[PDB]
Amino acid sequence: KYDVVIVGSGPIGCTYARELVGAGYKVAMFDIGEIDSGLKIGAHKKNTVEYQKNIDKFVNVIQGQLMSVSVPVNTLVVDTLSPTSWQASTFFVRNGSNPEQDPLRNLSGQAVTRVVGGMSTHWTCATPRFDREQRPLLVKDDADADDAEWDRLYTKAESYFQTGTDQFKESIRHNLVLNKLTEEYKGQRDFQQIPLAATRRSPTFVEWSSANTVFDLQNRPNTDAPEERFNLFPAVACERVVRNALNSEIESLHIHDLISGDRFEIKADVYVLTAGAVHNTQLLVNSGFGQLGRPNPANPPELLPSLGSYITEQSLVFCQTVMSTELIDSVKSDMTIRGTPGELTYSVTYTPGASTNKHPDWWNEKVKNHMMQHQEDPLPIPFEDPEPQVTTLFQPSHPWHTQIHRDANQSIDSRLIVDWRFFGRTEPKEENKLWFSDKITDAYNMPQPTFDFRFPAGRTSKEAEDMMTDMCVMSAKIGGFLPGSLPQFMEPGLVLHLGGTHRMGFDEKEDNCCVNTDSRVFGFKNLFLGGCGNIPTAYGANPTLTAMSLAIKSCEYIKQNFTPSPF
Amino acid sequence: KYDVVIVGSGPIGCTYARELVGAGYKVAMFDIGEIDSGLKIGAHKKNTVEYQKNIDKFVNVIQGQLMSVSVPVNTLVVDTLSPTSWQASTFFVRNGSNPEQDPLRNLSGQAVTRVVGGMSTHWTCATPRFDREQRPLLVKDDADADDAEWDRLYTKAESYFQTGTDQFKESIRHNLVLNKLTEEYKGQRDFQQIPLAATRRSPTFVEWSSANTVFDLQNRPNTDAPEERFNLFPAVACERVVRNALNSEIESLHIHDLISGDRFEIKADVYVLTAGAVHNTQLLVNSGFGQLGRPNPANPPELLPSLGSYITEQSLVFCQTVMSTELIDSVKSDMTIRGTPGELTYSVTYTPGASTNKHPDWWNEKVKNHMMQHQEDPLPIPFEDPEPQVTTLFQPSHPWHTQIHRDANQSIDSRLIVDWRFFGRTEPKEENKLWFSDKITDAYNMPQPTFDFRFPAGRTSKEAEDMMTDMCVMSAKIGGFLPGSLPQFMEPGLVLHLGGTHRMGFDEKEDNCCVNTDSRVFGFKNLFLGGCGNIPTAYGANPTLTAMSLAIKSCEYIKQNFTPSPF
Amino acid sequence: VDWRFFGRTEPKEENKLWFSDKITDAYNMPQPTFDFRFPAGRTSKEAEDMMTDMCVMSAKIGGFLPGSLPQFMEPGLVLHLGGTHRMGFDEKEDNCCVNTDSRV
Amino acid sequence: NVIQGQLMSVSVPVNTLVVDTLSPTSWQASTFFVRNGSNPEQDPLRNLSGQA
Numbered sequence A, B: 001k002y003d004v005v006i007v008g009s010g011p012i013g014c015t016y017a018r019e020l021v022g023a024g025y026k027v028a029m030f031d032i033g034e035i036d037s038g039l040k041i042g043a044h045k046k047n048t049v050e051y052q053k054n055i056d057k058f059v060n061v062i063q064g065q066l067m068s069v070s071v072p073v074n075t076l077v078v079d080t081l082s083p084t085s086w087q088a089s090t091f092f093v094r095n096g097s098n099p100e101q102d103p104l105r106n107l108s109g110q111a112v113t114r115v116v117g118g119m120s121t122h123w124t125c126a127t128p129r130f131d132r133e134q135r136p137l138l139v140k141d142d143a144d145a146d147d148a149e150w151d152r153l154y155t156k157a158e159s160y161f162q163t164g165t166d167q168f169k170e171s172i173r174h175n176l177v178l179n180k181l182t183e184e185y186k187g188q189r190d191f192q193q194i195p196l197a198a199t200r201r202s203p204t205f206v207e208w209s210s211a212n213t214v215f216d217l218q219n220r221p222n223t224d225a226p227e228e229r230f231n232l233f234p235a236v237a238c239e240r241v242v243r244n245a246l247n248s249e250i251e252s253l254h255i256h257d258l259i260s261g262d263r264f265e266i267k268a269d270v271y272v273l274t275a276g277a278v279h280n281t282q283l284l285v286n287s288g289f290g291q292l293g294r295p296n297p298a299n300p301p302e303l304l305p306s307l308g309s310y311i312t313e314q315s316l317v318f319c320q321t322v323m324s325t326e327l328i329d330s331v332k333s334d335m336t337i338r339g340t341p342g343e344l345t346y347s348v349t350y351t352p353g354a355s356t357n358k359h360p361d362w363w364n365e366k367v368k369n370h371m372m373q374h375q376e377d378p379l380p381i382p383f384e385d386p387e388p389q390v391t392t393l394f395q396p397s398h399p400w401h402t403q404i405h406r407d408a409n410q411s412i413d414s415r416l417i418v419d420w421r422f423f424g425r426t427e428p429k430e431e432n433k434l435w436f437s438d439k440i441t442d443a444y445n446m447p448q449p450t451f452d453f454r455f456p457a458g459r460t461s462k463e464a465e466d467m468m469t470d471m472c473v474m475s476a477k478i479g480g481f482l483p484g485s486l487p488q489f490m491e492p493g494l495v496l497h498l499g500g501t502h503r504m505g506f507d508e509k510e511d512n513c514c515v516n517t518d519s520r521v522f523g524f525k526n527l528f529l530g531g532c533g534n535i536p537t538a539y540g541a542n543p544t545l546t547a548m549s550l551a552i553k554s555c556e557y558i559k560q561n562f563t564p565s566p567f
Numbered sequence C: 001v002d003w004r005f006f007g008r009t010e011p012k013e014e015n016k017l018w019f020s021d022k023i024t025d026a027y028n029m030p031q032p033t034f035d036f037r038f039p040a041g042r043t044s045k046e047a048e049d050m051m052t053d054m055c056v057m058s059a060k061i062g063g064f065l066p067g068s069l070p071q072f073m074e075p076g077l078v079l080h081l082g083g084t085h086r087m088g089f090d091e092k093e094d095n096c097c098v099n100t101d102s103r104v
Numbered sequence D: 001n002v003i004q005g006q007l008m009s010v011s012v013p014v015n016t017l018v019v020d021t022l023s024p025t026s027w028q029a030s031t032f033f034v035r036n037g038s039n040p041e042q043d044p045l046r047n048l049s050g051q052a
């Protein structure tokens, strides 16, 4: 028996733990995954010396822990088998495929991560705020009060994540890109560093934030926290929350211990579901909320009818570019260069502090030393130059988020290469659904998730195409596309920004929603949901900071309404 | 000051730790890599519930921690860049390529793993013994004595790794393949389970062994080992062992703390280098052994002239097959079938204990149950059936090792798919070298490894091609090739069975070697090397068990010649 | 729908087609060799602006077809090579080979 | 296919692609020698490789 139970140890679950453990509550947390980021439980897997020396290899870490949500039955013809080899006569259900899934109405790129710390063990750490246009209301009819509340919540969330906008300031590549783009837009658009949940440790090492940063996930009481009470139980599949008959309270959490194999129930005062946008919905439907099986509107569910509807996933367009000759030449614009590299007579000089220099001394010293010490290398950019991390944030006139950067997720020198990702907002629509099969089960014997999704016609589709054209226009100012990384739409859901599955609003019926602004499930005194599933709006920016802000507000309600047990 | 220092926390360094910590030595171990396998330090990363339910994803973990040893300068032509993008006029040194490396005399597949536990955090766990044809002598002029010593050491090594040959005995696929090959080669070749360092925990979970199995890597003293002394120090690059001017002793170990950046000098009575075949050799050359730089026979080294010569790497051929119709039908040969699947009166039955049955009762029960419970599925093989793990071990008449299995490293049902890997032996030749640049450095600022390797032209090459042919012949008995996994040689070194880089012999001169049969570096009182680099022969079987056997012997010597410090 | 936009290339003395004095082609004639780059100024600026124009214009009709994404084609695949024996009024002043009657 | 069938490349540079999965028994040169009708005069980076 606990004061609070939390399902999921990602960053949102850790937000609840951070708030509630600190406030004196007896907290248990369960995760279906296991501890696997070293001794700092739930930490970013990219924070090893080896990955930061070999960042090209981290893509495999990511790929290794993204398990696809819904894979349709495969209908590829292989007709070059030997005649002796067994072959079926039909495209039968095999290799994990979901026979409920229409392959043409899927989010084929959607995937989940079952490890302690969740997706925060691999994420890119971009943590922008949403502007009003993207942001759910927390106060109705008072924009100033709504702004105040959001500013306070985001500020706290930025603290928890260690968000900053300074960590890349001494990158020549970063500055080359930012300054060019700012020139070219002539005041029409603002460029800044991507706000990043991270702390630079040295010129070549960044400590990327994660769930661990928000809450260290060590059992308590401990030497550092002798009055706090926290237990983490990894490898525990949480299966059902038990409703009373009134549907006003949850009475227990049913769990499956994956190691021992045994099933147990856990009693708490407060139940918090932070299992991700897909898996929160799964656990709710497996507990009698919404509707199990293929949507049947002749028989609308009577508990939480908007659960699994109005789902939103962002369009994502991507390319890479190769830095223009003009830009590369500009790096050395202050230099006086004589002779031929590699010969006796060659020299590269600049005047320190000259007001007519385009660049500061630190830049020109780095460029001079590279050019003089590495005369075999034809570029002016130092080898260990940090990567670019640039954004122009969503605005009404360009309603997409942008990242102009190097993401982990070879003929051309990497110093020339810049990634472009533009993220569209998707209108919530009732027909876009995440539902669960009443007969097919997944690898943990839970109802199999199935999507029924298409990008809404109208504004969403128009904007997604305008967004593609915007990426093509803007990237051109920096360089031409890198062959093999040409402008493209990414597989639906590969972006992993799914929202709206258990969406927030003021009124269950009027706002077609599942939780109120305290993240409390309508009707239930002691059930709360956290995560991107809560977000009910069309948004283009990366959602986790916003989800964390909502979680902070939800914890405030819990602190106002439930008393910790005596220690 | 420690009694013993060990460089490297792989399964070999852990063999030394197990033995010497257990003998009461004050032991320090250093690894350049970090703790990242969960709370069991150095354990197998595949030992998670999620990976064993998604085995298809583990390949990405492997790829994520194999960092290529020597990458040649890239000469691919990219001539569809935009006219505005920067381009060099030459194929200059970029993206961490090694300009010393002839791309045509490389082991391009060779890679290293820098994590606590080394490569045993991702390995396949195949641990066969070598027969006399593949194995160095430990006793001269007495074959029965040599056999007896090898049997004693291998039996101990098998206990350390928890090697077994029974963990897959209840797999229908395994037995299907094993029995068919036994029948086809009646009286010509013998087949058995691959000996595997693994313990089965349930019908769907195997605890694969690793460094952590051999030694748990927990600092000591501790509650369970109150009288032992052991410290592990991750994220520490060991750079040099300091030789006296006599070249008779090592005086200290120089280390670089990668977190803090500082360097230190560590003293021990005994120094053990278990950094892998590549990095053992690197550390030694960086410490004045052998020769730094492109080899120069006009100036042979003074100290250990055989170091980095006579290197061996195995040829490896690969394909996959799709199980034959005849074999698939044979799985259900004892069943009586009535009706059509999906109909109310469909029936699959068998008679338990019937003399005419071709299979044991447990087999038929599994088949009947799958066919009745999954009438939509056209195959008789149960869904959770463990993979095949079959071998015919190396013999004079078929001088290659074989694995007929499923290794972690989509239209066709995976139940049909078998992997074939045949591994050739490579003659040691002085000309095949691993050397280290005197001007290029690697990501840790150590002399850049460079290979000069070709498969020797005579027996090695003849056998390699005969081995290919043997896989084509043998595989056809099970099924045709899987399109996209057709019979092929794998890139040189992808097999990661490199040997002979610091090779063992009785006589440094006569046997062209670096260590004696106690793995002690000739001339030096207190320096020992462990790993496959010690193996001086041509071998086709997987080397790690043999390396460990040699380490046990080395440890006996240390125990007999050095006194632990008083506790 | 296919989209092909074709840029103009400034004539520059340095961009050459020449013929080996030792290598021969399949008909035993001196082997052709190019020494070509797109000129760095107006030609290159226009080329990239042309790319951008195709992306902008094409979007009015539909999105790109996966596998035929916007790209520069290999140099010369267009087969619109010119100026190898070029016309002018004055052999010297106009750096040319034929007059306006195409007479050498 | 008719088009491709009658476009004969004008100048093909010397090929430097690394093929390191040949069988140990197959012949291999130790250099990227002039082969398969390539033009050793041609700088592969100052070509019109598409010309035919």
Ligand SMILES: *Cc1cc2c(cc1C)nc1c(=O)[nH]c(=O)nc-1n2C[C@H](O)[C@H](O)[C@H](O)COP(=O)(O)OP(=O)(O)OC[C@H]1O[C@@H](n2cnc3c(N)ncnc32)[C@H](O)[C@@H]1O
Pocket: A007, A008, A009, A010, A011, A012, A013, A014, A030, A031, A032, A033, A062, A113, A114, A115, A116, A117, A118, A119, A120, A122, A123, A124, A125, A126, A127, A236, A237, A238, A239, A274, A275, A276, A277, A279, A280, A283, A409, A496, A530, A531, A532, A542, A543, A544, A545
């Ligand atoms: C994968 C990815 C994600 C990502 C990113 C890049 C990649 C490659 N870049 C991001 C960025 O730059 N900015 C941003 O805002 N987001 C970015 N993301 C997404 C981000 O990682 C997620 O939005 C965030 O991690 C969501 O947090 P949340 O805490 O809500 O969920 P989670 O991380 O998925 O963790 C959920 C956990 O719950 C567990 N679980 C699941 N089901 C169960 C059940 N039934 N029982 C018990 N536990 C369960 C998981 O195992 C997991 O740990």
Ligand SMILES: *Cc1cc2c(cc1C)nc1c(=O)[nH]c(=O)nc-1n2C[C@H](O)[C@H](O)[C@H](O)COP(=O)(O)OP(=O)(O)OC[C@H]1O[C@@H](n2cnc3c(N)ncnc32)[C@H](O)[C@@H]1O
Pocket: B007, B008, B009, B010, B011, B012, B013, B030, B031, B032, B033, B062, B066, B113, B114, B115, B116, B117, B118, B119, B120, B122, B123, B124, B125, B126, B127, B236, B237, B238, B239, B274, B275, B276, B277, B279, B283, B409, B496, B530, B531, B532, B542, B543, B544, B545
């Ligand atoms: C990658 C791989 C390995 C493998 C295999 C499958 C794959 C995909 N399957 C195998 C199998 O079935 N059977 C078998 O016998 N071998 C298998 N292997 C190879 C096997 O994993 C290795 O042979 C074995 O791990 C070697 O053990 P050893 O202990 O000698 O070496 P290591 O595991 O490489 O660990 C060495 C460590 O030392 C560190 N290091 C390196 N340099 C330094 C320096 N300078 N300073 C301090 N430490 C250093 C590493 O970081 C590492 O952990």
Ligand SMILES: OC[C@H]1O[C@@H](O)[C@H](F)[C@@H](O)[C@@H]1O
Pocket: A124, A125, A126, A403, A407, A409, A421, A494, A495, A496, A497, A542
């Ligand atoms: O792969 C798509 C991802 O790419 C990164 O650039 C973003 F920061 C993420 O928010 C997103 O999940």
Ligand SMILES: OC[C@H]1O[C@@H](O)[C@H](F)[C@@H](O)[C@@H]1O
Pocket: B124, B125, B126, B403, B407, B409, B421, B494, B495, B496, B497, B542
């Ligand atoms: O990928 C090559 C590897 O594959 C596995 O099947 C083996 F067991 C190994 O010994 C080897 O390292």
Ligand SMILES: OC[C@H]1O[C@@H](O)[C@H](F)[C@@H](O)[C@@H]1O
Pocket: C004, C077, C078, C079, C080
């Ligand atoms: O493939 C390039 C060619 O394509 C066609 O569309 C054009 F009409 C041509 O003038 C040109 O030679």
